Write a protein that binds this ligand. Sequence first.
Ligand SMILES: Nc1nc2c(ncn2[C@@H]2O[C@H](COP(=O)(O)OP(=O)(O)O)[C@@H](O)[C@H]2O)c(=O)[nH]1
Length: 330
Amino acid sequence: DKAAVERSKMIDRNLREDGEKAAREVKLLLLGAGESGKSTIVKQMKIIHEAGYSEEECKQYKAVVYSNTIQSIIAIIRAMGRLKIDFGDAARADDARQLFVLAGAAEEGFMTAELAGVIKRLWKDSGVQACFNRSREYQLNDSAAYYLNDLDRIAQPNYIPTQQDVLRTRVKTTGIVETHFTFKDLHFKMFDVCFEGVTAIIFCVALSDYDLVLAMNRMHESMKLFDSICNNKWFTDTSIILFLNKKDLFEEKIKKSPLTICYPEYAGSNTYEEAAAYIQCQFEDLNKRKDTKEIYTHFTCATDTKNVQFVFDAVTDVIILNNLKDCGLF
Ligand SMILES: Nc1nc2c(ncn2[C@@H]2O[C@H](COP(=O)(O)OP(=O)(O)O)[C@@H](O)[C@H]2O)c(=O)[nH]1
């Protein structure tokens, strides 16, 4: 590849006693609005480039899986009230009450056969399903269906979270998180959040946000943020990578909700191909120097390890081709 040839032109290692063993460093910022997939990308770097989630590491997330699951079903049940949606079978009302009894007396996320039964019956009720499909009207974890559909597995007494279970978790990130990994002989220093000596920025956008935060919308907030970042002077020589993320969730809701909810002027078809393209153009068009800065856009599913590996391999080649000269040796 051209990236291997390009890096082979460097001579700065020759200036160093032990240059062939020096570490060339890459500083990478992860930016984007809340819930766009930043921490998930961080988890994937650990999985792909460093030690996987040991059986004991996964175990640590067990009560997070329960907590996320409990939160999800509760959001849907409470929404039924505000949106005036009745249960399919009126016996579910007792189960709804029982959900609040059990959650209300517990210390933290937990699972029992009794709770599992309550949640399972609620989740396969037609009215609950009707409310679920109107999730754009309220706030619901994107991993709700993932965990609730797999409730039987999760509820087993000897449950051990799989890697996907962990990637699917929602954990609140406060402050700045710095992770380190080595790939293609590059020592990445990755920061989950404006830094100056930044080699590359990966900006995450939740595509599936286009019909969310009704009461400008989520997608427009993300655009406003990208506009600011992409055009900042501090990032002139910084490679700007755009992850249009949650493409899996987007593909599913596109055939259900029209893009016009977000962009009223959109007149294309409501298909994945045309709507994804349109969003990509909306973001890329925010670049205020279309002759000195290129944006590198990828459609990602951050919870998909193989897709993130493929995409990050491509991002790495962009960095090697464009930024290697400003990357120091240590
Ligand atoms: N289905 C799906 N879920 C995702 C994707 N990316 C992130 N998530 C989930 O979305 C939730 C929030 O993601 P997170 O990485 O914590 O966002 P952050 O606030 O930017 O750090 C988590 O439950 C993730 O598992 C994706 O591409 N597809």
